[PDB]
Nucleic acid binder design. Structure first.
Ligand SMILES: [Mg+2]
Lengths: 434, 429
RNA sequence: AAAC
């Protein structure tokens, strides 16, 4: 006996609740408007002209081969309401360690020498650099300076020009060039201090936390694993806290866990950020991870959490398949259907067919996320609604929704960035990682 | 009077018309466009232009340049313009770059462009509207959102209409779970995984569903077995949770039954005429080419061709007891001539991610169900050997779920668009 | 290193 959750509605400008972020962006515009986008460019002169060509392309609307599953791109100013010109482009010419060293040197020298501030920076990477080597290393080295950066290749904006020995392009964007421009524009607008959208049907004073763990291969200790956390209220603009590098991973068990001397630190960082950003303490806190926590971590979390806060710990897993199949039709079970295994364990179908797109987010068959309230006491349907909402807030890709909630989607990427550089200490919003 | 009539090419320019129209009702205008109603007609359209319409617009694109509908709209709008002596009653909205000069309708060339950007065009249109005394309401995006949900998302809703899992129930279990003890400890080099029957070395005991005489002829002659020290637990209360002793706890009972079921399945797949595959975690179990009738079973294909490789739809299994079910995970394992497995796993994964496309709900469901029926002993059951007399009965029909909402099943050509486009995209990946 |  399945249960269905009405798809979460997200606000856009003018206080209007839509469901597809692209539809709302093209209809009401971004929820928070920015006056404009000042962009910075670092790369070769050919990279500069490729980037200029791609903005000329972005100004004009670009279309998808399917405009229902991937709505068309109205053009940057049409959807966002802020201009991204080529006159606002600051360029510094460039003629694995050494390459990222020069690129970072140019970025820092620009951020210091230039009088006019730049909203976002965009880095053009030649194809030879991609083939012979970067994103994690460079984007980590820029975490100290709080520089929001977006990396694009020569073959991403000028894919038509780059062709193989057979004459065909290396990678074809013809059917989703509009979608590619959609995603690039949404990323650039997010990194420019603008919040494209936020959840609408959400209770006040609720926080969502996601722990991430990444092992270090170069470490002599095979057990070592860095930790991190990601925090979201409803905005989808999450604050990321770096953890402590050390013996985190459980090798024989295969799990990741925190000693109580760092779980306190991480959750206290999360709660102090909440208090700074809200001036009150949350009524509920939900912590998300790929694994169940031991009682050590939960008790460490409970000591630092205030009494009036109903702290809840919920784990999200791509566990052994409960792959539901609709009896008739090649159309899978719709996204948003949930199975109440028990008051603390449920399945959430964040992938699959969605009626709004008349399309499927998942490729083969939607593997549901098994969500488990391993710790704490909370109503299971509310947790499923919260995770369904959190699936919508991936600003790095302009898509209807994400299979993994944003509290855990970028775990691998943020871990790679954090462990890319070992001699760097960082306080930061999610826009400095995606 | 007060309306703002937009005329356009319906099939080809509906993107821009949608965008402009919805933006204009957002700004409080009383906009009238051919796409803003359901179950619509020329008597009504002409009525609005003659009396209700205060401003009229056309979309001067190449596709809509010569259209009978839009041209007749232009004609009636010209009549209303002559009646109302308005110099800019009809407004071109040129959105097409390829539309060259002196190629537009003659009534239009002599008269706002969106070629560079729809935002600039919308701003030009808005200032042109403001220069004239265009009646409007205070900006109300709520009604624009209501129209967007009522018109453009009417066919994209969810029906309140009333699913086949991969979870196959276990109707019956062997009544007793037995632990065997021997006078001499079994050798450390003696692997219980080599035992012909499922057996888990739990503490010094051997956990089974079976009896003593099953492995009497494979145990080493240096091991002497005693029938007194074997301890049995009632399985019904193992599921019911009523069992409570210090020697073994319920949380361990269910987990022990889990690995017992897993090993029973793995050993059953030796007498089920199924070949094996090494993956990261467990054993994959696939059907060999040349064995199954035309690579089909109950008219569902299970083995097929992919370039010079051959794909075999294999499965893996894992039990659970929360309701006692078994999950089957579906894998696709390739061989190079139907016989020899691919040595390197990277090509295996790349080829699997290539193959998984073109397969959807019905295809995956039918393939998994066909493999399960091929693995059945009885028509409506699967027998796993755990003991010489004890059998584990797992119904070969997966669990059924009573839903309450679903979608209007759309045209399958939309899913074919999905298949082709996403196939190309994953090739790019 | 558009992106899942
Ligand atoms: Mg990104």
């Amino acid at each position: 006996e399945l249960i269905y959750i009405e798809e979460p509605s997200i606000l856009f400008a003018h206080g209007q609740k839509c469901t597809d972020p692209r539809d709302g962006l093209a209809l009401f515009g971004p929820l928070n408007q920015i006056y404009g986008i000042k962009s910075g460019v670092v790369g070769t002169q050919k990279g500069l002209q490729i980037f200029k060509s791609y903005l000329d392309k972005i100004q004009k609307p670009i279309y998808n081969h399917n405009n229902i599953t991937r709505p068309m791109f109205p053009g940057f100013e049409a959807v966002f309401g802020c201009k991204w010109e080529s006159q606002n482009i600051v360029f510094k010419e460039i003629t694995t360690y050494d390459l990222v060293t020069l690129f970072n040197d140019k970025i820092i020298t620009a951020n210091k020498n230039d009088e006019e501030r730049v909203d976002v920076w965009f880095v053009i990477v030649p194809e030879e650099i991609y083939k012979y080597c970067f994103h994690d290393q460079l984007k980590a080295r820029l975490l100290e300076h709080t520089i929001p950066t977006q990396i694009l290749r020569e073959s991403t904006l000028a894919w038509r020009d780059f062709k193989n020995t057979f004459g065909a392009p290396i990678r074809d964007f013809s059917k989703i060039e509009g979608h590619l421009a959609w995603t690039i524009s949404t990323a650039a607008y997010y990194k420019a201090g603008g919040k494209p959208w936020k959840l609408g049907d959400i209770r006040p004073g609720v926080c969502y936390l996601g722990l991430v763990y990444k092992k270090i291969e170069k470490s002599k200790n095979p057990q070592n694993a860095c930790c991190a956390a990601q925090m979201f209220l409803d905005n989808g603009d999450g604050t990321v806290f770096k953890g402590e590098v050390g013996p985190w991973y459980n090798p024989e068990k295969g799990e990741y866990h925190l000693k109580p001397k760092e779980a306190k630190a991480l959750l206290t960082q999360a709660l102090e950020s909440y208090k700074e950003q809200n001036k009150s303490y949350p009524k509920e806190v939900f912590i998300h991870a790929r694994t169940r926590f031991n009682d050590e971590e939960w008790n460490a979390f409970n000591e630092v959490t205030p009494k009036n806060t109903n702290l809840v710990g919920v784990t999200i897993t791509k566990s052994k398949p409960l792959k539901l199949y609709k009896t008739e039709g090649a159309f899978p079970i719709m996204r948003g259907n949930a199975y109440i295994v028990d008051e603390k364990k449920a399945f959430l179908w964040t992938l699959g067919f969605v009626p709004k797109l008349q399309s499927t987010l998942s490729m083969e068959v939607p593997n549901p996320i098994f969500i488990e309230i391993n710790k704490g006491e909370a109503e299971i349907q509310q947790v499923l609604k919260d995770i369904l909402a959190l699936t919508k807030l991936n600003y790095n890709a302009c898509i209807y929704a994400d299979g993994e909630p944003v509290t855990l989607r970028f775990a691998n990427k943020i871990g790679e960035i954090l462990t890319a550089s070992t001699e760097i200490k960082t306080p930061l919003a999610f826009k400095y990682y995606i | 009077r007060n309306k703002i009539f937009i005329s356009h090419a319906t099939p080809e320019d509906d993107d821009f018309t949608r965008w402009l129209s919805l933006k204009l009702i957002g700004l409080g205008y009383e906009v009238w466009c051919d796409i803003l109603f359901l179950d619509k007609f020329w008597s009504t359209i002409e009525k609005e232009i003659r009396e209700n319409t205060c401003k009229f617009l056309i979309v001067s694109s190449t596709a809509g340049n010569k259209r009978e509908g839009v041209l007749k709209e232009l004609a009636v709008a010209t009549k209303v313009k002559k009646h109302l002596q308005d110099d800019m009653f009809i407004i071109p909205l040129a959105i097409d770059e390829n539309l060259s000069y002196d190629d537009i309708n003659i009534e239009i060339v002599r008269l706002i462009d969106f070629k560079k950007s729809w935002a600039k065009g919308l701003q030009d249109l808005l200032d042109a509207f403001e220069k004239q005394n265009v009646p409007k309401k205070p900006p109300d995006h709520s009604k624009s959102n209501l129209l967007y949900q009522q018109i453009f998302l009417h066919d994209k809703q969810a029906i309140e209409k009333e699913y086949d899992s991969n979870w196959f129930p276990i109707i019956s279990f062997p009544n007793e779970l037995r632990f065997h003890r021997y006078d001499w400890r079994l050798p450390k080099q003696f692997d219980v995984r080599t035992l012909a029957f499922p057996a888990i070395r739990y503490k010094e005991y051997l956990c089974t569903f079976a009896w003593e005489y099953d492995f009497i002829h494979q145990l080493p002659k240096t091991e002497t077995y005693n029938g007194q020290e074997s301890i049995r637990i009632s399985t019904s209360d193992i599921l019911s949770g009523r069992y409570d002793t210090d020697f073994i706890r319920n949380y361990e009972c269910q987990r022990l039954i889990v690995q017992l079921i897993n090993k029973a399945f793995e050993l059953r797949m030796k007498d089920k005429n199924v070949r094996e595959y090494q993956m990261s975690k467990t054993f994959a179990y696939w059907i060999e080419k040349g064995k199954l009738e035309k690579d089909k079973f109950e008219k569902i294909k299970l083995v097929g061709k992919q370039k010079n490789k051959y794909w075999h739809f294999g499965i893996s299994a894992a039990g659970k007891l929360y309701s006692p079910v078994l999950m089957v995970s579906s894998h696709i394992i390739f061989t190079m001539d139907g016989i020899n497995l691919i040595k390197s796993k990277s090509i295996q994964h790349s080829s699997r991610r290539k193959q998984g496309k073109n397969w959807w709900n019905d295809k995956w469901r039918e393939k998994l169900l066909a493999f399960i029926r091929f693995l059945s002993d009885d028509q409506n059951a699967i027998y796993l050997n755990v003991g010489s007399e004890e059998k584990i009965l797992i119904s070969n029909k997966p669990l059924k779920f009573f839903g309450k909402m679903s979608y209007v099943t759309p045209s399958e050509v939309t899913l074919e668009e999905e298949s082709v486009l996403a196939d190309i995209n994953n090739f790019e990946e």
